[PDB]
Amino acid sequence: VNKDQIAKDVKQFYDQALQQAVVDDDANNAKAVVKTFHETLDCCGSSTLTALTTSVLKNNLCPSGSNIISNLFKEDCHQKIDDLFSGKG
Amino acid sequence: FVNKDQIAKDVKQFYDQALQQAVVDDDANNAKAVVKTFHETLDCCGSSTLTALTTSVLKNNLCPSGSNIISNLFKEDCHQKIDDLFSGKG
Lengths: 89, 90
Fold this sequence. Notes:
- 2 copies of one chain form a homodimer.
- The first copy, chain A, has helices spanning 3-22, 30-41, 48-57, 77-86.
- By secondary structure, chain A is an all-alpha fold.
- The first copy, chain A, is globular, with a radius of gyration of 12 Å.
- The two termini of chain A are 22 Å apart.
- It is classed as cell adhesion.
- Keywords: human cellular receptor for Hepatitis C virus, cell adhesion.
- It forms a dimeric assembly.
């Protein structure tokens, strides 16, 4: 049961929710899901740029307490997903 | 395209594999690392209440920092935490 493939698939699932969530579309619960990921992994986007734009534009999605500049130092959620499945946290 | 159920099952399966390897083989340092990371991240210590208990007993260092053995009987197991993640319940 391959590690890299599942990791890719989680990243994809996240990305899906994120695309649905930034729109305030929630027909598949994407908002709660993105919020759950972001709080669990302490990230706010599929990349630095994305985290930062999501924080600027959809600030309610980011980890509570975190400010916007922090998305330039933190790891993005794809990185954190990789850490989860590779064992670095 | 990714279905929620399937990826959650796949993640659970992956977690189970790592947990088994991590508990019975003390040199599978990659499995241990992963297991430990799942555990700290999701705040749980097994596939189920019982396996969380046996994990806390055989390799307690795999459990979340400052967690206690008896609490594994009252806490959500990692399967339920993984479902919570993909389902949207923090």
